Amino acid sequence: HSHGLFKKLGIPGPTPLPFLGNILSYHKGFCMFDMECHKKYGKVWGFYDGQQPVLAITDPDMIKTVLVKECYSVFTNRRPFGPVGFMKSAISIAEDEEWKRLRSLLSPTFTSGKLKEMVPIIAQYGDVLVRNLRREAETGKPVTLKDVFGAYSMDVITSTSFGVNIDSLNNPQDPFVENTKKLLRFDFLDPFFLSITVFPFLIPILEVLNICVFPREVTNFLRKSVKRMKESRLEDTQKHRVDFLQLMIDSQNSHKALSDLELVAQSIIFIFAGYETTSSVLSFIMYELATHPDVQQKLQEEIDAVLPNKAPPTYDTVLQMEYLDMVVNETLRLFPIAMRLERVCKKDVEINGMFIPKGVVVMIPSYALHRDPKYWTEPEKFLPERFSKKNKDNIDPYIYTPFGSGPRNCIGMRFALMNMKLALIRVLQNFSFKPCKETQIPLKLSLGGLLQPEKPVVLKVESR
Numbered sequence: 001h002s003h004g005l006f007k008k009l010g011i012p013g014p015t016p017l018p019f020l021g022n023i024l025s026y027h028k029g030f031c032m033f034d035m036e037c038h039k040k041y042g043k044v045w046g047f048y049d050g051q052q053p054v055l056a057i058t059d060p061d062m063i064k065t066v067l068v069k070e071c072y073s074v075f076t077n078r079r080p081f082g083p084v085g086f087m088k089s090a091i092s093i094a095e096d097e098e099w100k101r102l103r104s105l106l107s108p109t110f111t112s113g114k115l116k117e118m119v120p121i122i123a124q125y126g127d128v129l130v131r132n133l134r135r136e137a138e139t140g141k142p143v144t145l146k147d148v149f150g151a152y153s154m155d156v157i158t159s160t161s162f163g164v165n166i167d168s169l170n171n172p173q174d175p176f177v178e179n180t181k182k183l184l185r186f187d188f189l190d191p192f193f194l195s196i197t198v199f200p201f202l203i204p205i206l207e208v209l210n211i212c213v214f215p216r217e218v219t220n221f222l223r224k225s226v227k228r229m230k231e232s233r234l235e236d237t238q239k240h241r242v243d244f245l246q247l248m249i250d251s252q253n254s255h256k257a258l259s260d261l262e263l264v265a266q267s268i269i270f271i272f273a274g275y276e277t278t279s280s281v282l283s284f285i286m287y288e289l290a291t292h293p294d295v296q297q298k299l300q301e302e303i304d305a306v307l308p309n310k311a312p313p314t315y316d317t318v319l320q321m322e323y324l325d326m327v328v329n330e331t332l333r334l335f336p337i338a339m340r341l342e343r344v345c346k347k348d349v350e351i352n353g354m355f356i357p358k359g360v361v362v363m364i365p366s367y368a369l370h371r372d373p374k375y376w377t378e379p380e381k382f383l384p385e386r387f388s389k390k391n392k393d394n395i396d397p398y399i400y401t402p403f404g405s406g407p408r409n410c411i412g413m414r415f416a417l418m419n420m421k422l423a424l425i426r427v428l429q430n431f432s433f434k435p436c437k438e439t440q441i442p443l444k445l446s447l448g449g450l451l452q453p454e455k456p457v458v459l460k461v462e463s464r
């Protein structure tokens with residue numbers, strides 16, 4: 001039907017099948033498809049997700065025009081992904097003016113001043129992490145990274161978002177833990193979302209039936225859980241609070257006001273954005289450290305230098321360690337878990353000599369651009385020196401976009417980096433991580449819609 005747009009514009013791309021587009025080319029995942037397309041179609045190419053035209057762009061100037069320059073005018077919203085319900089008020093899903101209102105009311109919550117006030121909290125569960133990690137080391141068994149880092153992320157969110165201070169690895173089946181553990185990422189190549197892509201006309205049907213991609217058990221629990229602590233346990237209390245909920249509650253005190261429904265929407269999305277992301281990235285970081293022990297030692301030397309004798313990490317301490325920042329950044333280059341930055345074109349626009357039709361999804365292949373031979377040397381190699389002070393200025397901010405760019409970039413980039421580094425400091429201060437017999441030395445990525453290892457990463461943990 002609409003599979004004639006990219007031919008009439010002279011834009012190359014794979015030839016679309018009726019009713020399906022190039023969806024069948026996702027048999028090797030999102031990232032492998034963009035890598036191959038980049039090789040055989042050049043700098044700009046197009047494809048169809050069902051009947052949805054998608055234009056991929058790789059020019060840094062064009063990317064900056066979409067993400068930064070023309071963000072408010074045209075490239076304001078992302079691609080709608082499915083039946084959302086009340087979660088349509090989340091900032092990552094909001095569109096047009098409501099997003100601008102929500103971005104304004106939530107930006108002060110992510111101030112670096114607020115992050116510093118949350119450092120003692122997430123450092124508390126860094127200590128909790130090594131205690132439970134020492135148990136897994138004294139057991140002498142290969143440790144699964146997703147489980148220890150998952151529980152650390154659980155502790156961080158439940159404390160920094162609501163204030164429920166609870167250990168998670170040794171205290172499962174807790175009400176908050178059991179439900180928030182169900183807020184798992186969306187595999188957009190699974191049967192449901194693949195069917196949704198082929199039948200986008202069924203999304204209105206699912207919405208009126210009150211069928212939502214977010215599990216209703218988790219959403220209704222958290223809206224009630226917020227309700228019990230929003231007023232029934234907060235107004236009858238004069239203690240100080242530092243969690244995200246309190247900062248959003250205080251926003252309601254004095255655009256417009258955050259609806260109590262809107263507040264629950266943002267609180268859930270911060271959990272959904274922060275739970276498996278940190279865990280996946282931290283797992284990826286420990287993989288590169290173990291397979292390259294030279295950088296693990298140098299990082300352990302730098303950490304022990306700034307913090308002698310396992311000194312408590314602090315906000316100003318973390319910003320000082322630059323080899324830690326190099327390791328984090330280089331992992332995010334190899335594994336940008338978003339895999340893709342997408343914007344929806346609200347009107348006919350010509351940018352950088354290219355005409356973009358209305359309704360086309362403009363996509364930035366972050367995984368492909370991070371491994372392009374044009375801008376990177378030995379792209380498959382883990383070389384943290386790329387982000388050294390001497391060499392970290394040759395990198396274009398629009399070819400390396402792990403947290404996105406422009407006004408719609410990750411609002412929790414500082415929180416994520418501070419949280420992940422704080423774990424890396426405490427964990428490395430007390431343990432050394434080495435490969436196992438069960439460890440996959442040539443780590444293979446999944447073929448689904450998530451940037452995750454094929455088999456779970458397992459490593460050997462020894463106390464220093």
Ligand code: HEM
Pocket residue numbers: 067091092093103269270271273274275277278281337338341342401402403404405406407408409410411412413415416
């Ligand atoms: C842990 C590692 C994380 C990574 C790699 C990451 C990456 C990203 C990326 C690539 C985007 C899209 C930006 C673009 O389209 O230009 C994004 C959006 C967003 N992220 Fe994250 N993110 C992370 C963690 C978090 C956390 C922990 C939070 C919550 C505190 C968060 C909140 C958000 C929000 C709210 C948006 C939407 C921004 C908006 O719509 O204006 N992210 N993130």
Ligand SMILES: O=C(Nc1cc(C(F)(F)F)ccc1-n1ccnc1)C1CCC1
Pocket residue numbers: 081090092093185186269272273274277337338410450451
């Ligand atoms: O989960 C992901 N993206 C994402 C999606 C949504 C939404 F579409 F459901 F609304 C909301 C928030 C985020 N998110 C995560 C981190 N920062 C923001 C990717 C990371 C691997 C899968």
